[PDB]
Amino acid sequence: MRGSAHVVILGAGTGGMPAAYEMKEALGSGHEVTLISANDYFQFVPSNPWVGVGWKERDDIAFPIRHYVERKGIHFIAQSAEQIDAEAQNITLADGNTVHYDYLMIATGPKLAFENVPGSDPHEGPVQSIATVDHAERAFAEYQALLREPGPIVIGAMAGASCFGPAYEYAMIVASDLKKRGMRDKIPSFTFITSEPYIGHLGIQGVGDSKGILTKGLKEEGIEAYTNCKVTKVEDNKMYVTQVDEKGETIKEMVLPVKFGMMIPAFKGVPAVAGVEGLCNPGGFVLVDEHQRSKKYANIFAAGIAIAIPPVETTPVPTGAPKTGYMIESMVSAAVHNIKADLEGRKGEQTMGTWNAVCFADMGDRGAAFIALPQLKPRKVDVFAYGRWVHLAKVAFEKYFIRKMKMGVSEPFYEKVLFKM
Amino acid sequence: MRGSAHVVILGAGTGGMPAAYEMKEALGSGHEVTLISANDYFQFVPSNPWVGVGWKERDDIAFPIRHYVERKGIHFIAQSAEQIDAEAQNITLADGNTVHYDYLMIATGPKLAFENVPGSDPHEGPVQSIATVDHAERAFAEYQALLREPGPIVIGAMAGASCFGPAYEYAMIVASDLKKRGMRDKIPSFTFITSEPYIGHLGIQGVGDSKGILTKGLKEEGIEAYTNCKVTKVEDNKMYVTQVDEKGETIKEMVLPVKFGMMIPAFKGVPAVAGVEGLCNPGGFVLVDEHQRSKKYANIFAAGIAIAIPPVETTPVPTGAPKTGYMIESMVSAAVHNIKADLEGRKGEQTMGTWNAVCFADMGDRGAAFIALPQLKPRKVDVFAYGRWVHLAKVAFEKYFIRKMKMGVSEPFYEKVLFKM
Ligand SMILES: Cc1cc2nc3c(=O)[nH]c(=O)nc-3n(C[C@H](O)[C@H](O)[C@H](O)COP(=O)(O)OP(=O)(O)OC[C@H]3O[C@@H](n4cnc5c(N)ncnc54)[C@H](O)[C@@H]3O)c2cc1C
Ligand SMILES: Cc1cc2nc3c(=O)[nH]c(=O)nc-3n(C[C@H](O)[C@H](O)[C@H](O)COP(=O)(O)OP(=O)(O)OC[C@H]3O[C@@H](n4cnc5c(N)ncnc54)[C@H](O)[C@@H]3O)c2cc1C
Ligand SMILES: CCCCCCCCCCCCO[C@@H]1O[C@H](CO)[C@@H](O[C@H]2O[C@H](CO)[C@@H](O)[C@H](O)[C@H]2O)[C@H](O)[C@H]1O
Ligand SMILES: CCCCCCCCCCCCO[C@@H]1O[C@H](CO)[C@@H](O[C@H]2O[C@H](CO)[C@@H](O)[C@H](O)[C@H]2O)[C@H](O)[C@H]1O
Ligand SMILES: CCCCCCCCCCC1=C(C)C(=O)C(OC)=C(OC)C1=O
Ligand SMILES: CCCCCCCCCCC1=C(C)C(=O)C(OC)=C(OC)C1=O
Ligand SMILES: [S]
Ligand SMILES: [S]
Ligand SMILES: [S]
Ligand SMILES: [S]
Ligand SMILES: [S]
Ligand SMILES: [S]
Ligand SMILES: [S]
Ligand SMILES: [S]
Numbered sequence A, B: 001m002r003g004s005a006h007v008v009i010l011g012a013g014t015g016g017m018p019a020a021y022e023m024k025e026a027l028g029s030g031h032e033v034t035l036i037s038a039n040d041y042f043q044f045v046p047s048n049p050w051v052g053v054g055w056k057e058r059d060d061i062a063f064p065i066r067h068y069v070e071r072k073g074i075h076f077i078a079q080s081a082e083q084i085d086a087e088a089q090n091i092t093l094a095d096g097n098t099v100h101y102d103y104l105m106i107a108t109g110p111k112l113a114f115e116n117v118p119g120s121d122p123h124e125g126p127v128q129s130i131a132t133v134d135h136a137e138r139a140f141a142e143y144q145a146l147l148r149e150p151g152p153i154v155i156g157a158m159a160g161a162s163c164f165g166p167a168y169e170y171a172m173i174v175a176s177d178l179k180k181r182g183m184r185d186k187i188p189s190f191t192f193i194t195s196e197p198y199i200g201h202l203g204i205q206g207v208g209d210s211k212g213i214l215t216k217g218l219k220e221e222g223i224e225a226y227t228n229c230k231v232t233k234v235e236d237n238k239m240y241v242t243q244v245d246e247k248g249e250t251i252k253e254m255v256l257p258v259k260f261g262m263m264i265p266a267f268k269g270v271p272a273v274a275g276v277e278g279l280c281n282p283g284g285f286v287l288v289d290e291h292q293r294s295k296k297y298a299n300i301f302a303a304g305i306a307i308a309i310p311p312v313e314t315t316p317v318p319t320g321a322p323k324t325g326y327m328i329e330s331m332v333s334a335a336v337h338n339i340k341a342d343l344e345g346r347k348g349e350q351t352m353g354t355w356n357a358v359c360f361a362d363m364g365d366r367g368a369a370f371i372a373l374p375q376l377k378p379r380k381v382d383v384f385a386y387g388r389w390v391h392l393a394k395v396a397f398e399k400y401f402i403r404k405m406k407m408g409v410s411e412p413f414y415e416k417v418l419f420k421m
Helices: A016-027 A045-052 A066-070 A133-148 A165-180 A210-220 A325-343 A388-407 B016-027 B045-052 B066-070 B133-148 B165-180 B210-220 B325-343 B388-407
Strands: A006-010 A032-036 A041-043 A062-064 A075-077 A081-085 A090-093 A098-100 A103-106 A110-112 A153-157 A190-194 A224-226 A229-235 A238-244 A250-257 A260-264 A267-269 A300-302 A357-362 A367-373 A381-387 B006-010 B032-036 B041-043 B062-064 B075-077 B081-085 B090-093 B098-100 B103-106 B110-112 B153-157 B190-194 B224-226 B229-235 B238-244 B250-257 B260-264 B267-269 B300-302 B357-362 B367-373 B381-387
Touching: A006 A016, A016 A032, A016 A066, A016 A103, A016 A325, A016 A388, A041 A045, A045 A133, A045 A165, A045 A357, A045 A388, A062 A066, A062 A388, A066 A075, A103 A325, A133 A260, A153 A165, A165 A190, A165 A210, A165 A260, A165 A357, A190 A229, A210 A224, A210 A381, A300 A325, A325 A357, A357 A388, A367 A388, A381 A388, A381 B381, B006 B016, B016 B032, B016 B066, B016 B103, B016 B325, B016 B388, B041 B045, B045 B133, B045 B165, B045 B357, B045 B388, B062 B066, B062 B388, B066 B075, B103 B325, B133 B260, B153 B165, B165 B190, B165 B210, B165 B260, B165 B357, B190 B229, B210 B224, B210 B381, B300 B325, B325 B357, B357 B388, B367 B388, B381 B388
Parallel strands: A006 A032, A006 A103, A032 A075, A103 A300, A153 A190, A153 A260, A190 A224, B006 B032, B006 B103, B032 B075, B103 B300, B153 B190, B153 B260, B190 B224
Antiparallel strands: A041 A062, A081 A090, A090 A098, A110 A267, A229 A238, A238 A250, A357 A367, A367 A381, B041 B062, B081 B090, B090 B098, B110 B267, B229 B238, B238 B250, B357 B367, B367 B381
């Protein structure tokens, strides 16, 4: 309402949860902050690969949202948005109720585009997913069925994927768990299929010695690896793969039987968001300016995987650059600051800052991590690390983030940097 | 004087220069700030290895101090301190004049302890030094004499050394320059001798894959490498080396002819500082608390290589941990803050923060760098990087630091971190 703006945050994930707390803290008691999300619980996404191999349980990485945001004055609606009318500024929920907003912050993350590859939906065949805790529990169930009846394994990343780290991670811990169960030698073949132009490209043209280190890691585990691949269909428990060369010409086709599989799908924008006229690019990603404001609607902002970021490279098989946690939080922080500014007359000048990608993968006793910025080479920081300490950092960060999501965030978030001061 | 404290900074190096500017900025017009140093010019130390192989000239890395600090209100005395009387609070200069102080900040850096190894002084034999621009110009002159009359090369680090990075760097660029001159095949032998327990220990128990990467680098260049070595004497152009095992027992002795050599010496405290009764440990390093205040004299502070830092490890051949640029600046910043606090009644609570080591080495087209913290394992950050980007960062940092040393420093120094914002 006038003088008491209603700010709605769509999606309670890595960007949306923090955004709700920060929005409420920034606006105070004079404004209404409503968080709307498809699930009633928060999940810590980077832990999903561990759930998928049974090293972690749902209860370790997820928790009910309601009580935590409500005690901060935030209204919570555990309902999926089905439709967004940007003119009337109304959101239609799954149950048919309508929520009005004065400002909308879209943090809806990715639609997992299984439809790009017929048969690839986790519910339609042997190719599973670890993108969400629901999918990862199902992936683990299929992993156990593999343990009962050993057969070929295929893990990797589809054409259009932008999130390659977790595929390597999942391949490695699957291999590790198989060894730990004395079951590794029962596996007929273990294949890694990726749309990357080379191993360890990671959608960012490589970082540090990612290529050499990931190549050697897969070889150490007896995992045969194919790059420049796109999967055309999954059918009769077989994966039809087409491999191209630098100029997109087919250099071979393959048919791989799959008893147990996991391919990271391409990400698109979720339907309620993509469905908003003039809001998104053809992928369903929100077109925003440097202030996280939609280029079409001045009272719509976006952060997280939901926003569109221009490519800088074009690979033989389509691939995308990842949108990772630290950059997401900078997007959120910026959106909250600029919305508050709007409420108080000013144009917020805050931006996301420099593009960066940061990723941590835990293999059990040791981890791998990278940091790359900015997007294009030569970079200011281009590092790849491996060791027990990376594992310890992942464990520590997970504990911290989950606690923050329960206790609330003021907050210039990453002051997890005073481990210096 | 009372109500107008006189603050003296001893030594105009990596810590002392910034300290003088920051002290003056922090105290203002009501207090006198005097900078006293042995040389009338500032030099950028990390560039010395390049001078030593002729890739850089003195004029690229050094400049006259006087006009730059004087225009900030800082008094400059280009004279070495010979004696410090901590009771009377008087400093005796080389020319016999005496300077009184109310507060003294010691930033005198290392005494290069050539006396530990008879014959090892650059002026007494073939073993040269790249620790200072004076030494590096002499090292380069000897390098040219090697070019005229090829003979064996020995590069490395003495027992008690704490600064290993530059030895590896110097070995690598010497090898590289020899190749570029079509002179590499004329060299009878190229040996690397270190007190480290293994290649790439770096006095910090290794960082990232420093061991594997430095080992392979030396092998690539046809440099034969010996660890756990101490040099007992240099005599008749021969280096007498003793190699021990884990328990300090001699496993062999060697006599290496040397036409051209460069060994990083052990560092001690400079004589004027070490000579102050009760100020220093037996190495001549100032004993300070976490606030950079001498444990004996409350109006004496210290920062940089001059302070004592307890060992965390004890190697078969004595070695030390390095004290590098970012930690030095945090020491300086702390000392300045706590001295100002003292002037205004309070006890400054500011500390150096977490121990860390950061180092950059430029090989020409590509560089190697590391970051390690804290000192003891398992670390929070333990990274080793290599690439063209490391080279670009070194080049950039040198330009920045030198410019800052001319323009002055307010200043919470490392905001060379807003390459993010
Ligand atoms: C397996 C995996 C591992 C990852 N590892 C890392 C890592 O190590 N480091 C790192 O920095 N990043 C990592 N990422 C990338 C990225 O940080 C995460 O994907 C992150 O969760 C993205 O945050 P988000 O807020 O944009 O989307 P999400 O966290 O997915 O949140 C989106 C939210 O919106 C909700 N939603 C969607 N549609 C609707 C709708 N119509 N109505 C209401 N709610 C809706 C969803 O339920 C969800 O709650 C990982 C990604 C995955 C998939
Ligand atoms: C070859 C080399 C490479 C290095 N590379 C790196 C690097 O890559 N990264 C990094 O972070 N660190 C590096 N270091 C380590 C460290 O950062 C430097 O040694 C740094 O210069 C130390 O700063 P300081 O202020 O303690 O001493 P210094 O910079 O040596 O300054 C001491 C000053 O005190 C003066 N002085 C000494 N005695 C007296 C006296 N009696 N009276 C008056 N003045 C006196 C000296 O002339 C000098 O000006 C390098 C060291 C060396 C030697
Ligand atoms: C985070 C995003 C990236 C993708 C996710 C993770 C992918 C899986 C990683 C597989 C790597 C396994 O392979 C491992 O690599 C490193 C090489 O750097 C080796 O380790 C080597 O360097 C490390 C330091 O970095 C040293 O501590 C170690 O002593 C040395 O041997 C290991 O001996 C090898 O076993
Ligand atoms: C900064 C303090 C440390 C000491 C100072 C410097 C010591 C000298 C460094 C010698 C290293 C030379 O050896 C070099 O190492 C790296 C391995 O990581 C290799 O490079 C490898 O990893 C890098 C990334 O980190 C990739 O960009 C590269 O494509 C890959 O081949 C090079 O092919 C090899 O030539
Ligand atoms: C340029 C700054 C990078 C941040 C590095 C320090 C600590 C944070 C690690 C990165 C990270 C972030 C930011 C993060 O938000 C996240 O969760 C989605 C992770 O997964 C575990 C991460 O690993
Ligand atoms: C933990 C923070 C580390 C700082 C990294 C970012 C940029 C600075 C590089 C380190 C460095 C410092 C601090 C530094 O003071 C210095 O000069 C003595 C260098 O030599 C070139 C350095 O390489
Ligand atoms: S997935
Ligand atoms: S990702
Ligand atoms: S990734
Ligand atoms: S990631
Ligand atoms: S040296
Ligand atoms: S050093
Ligand atoms: S070093
Ligand atoms: S260094």
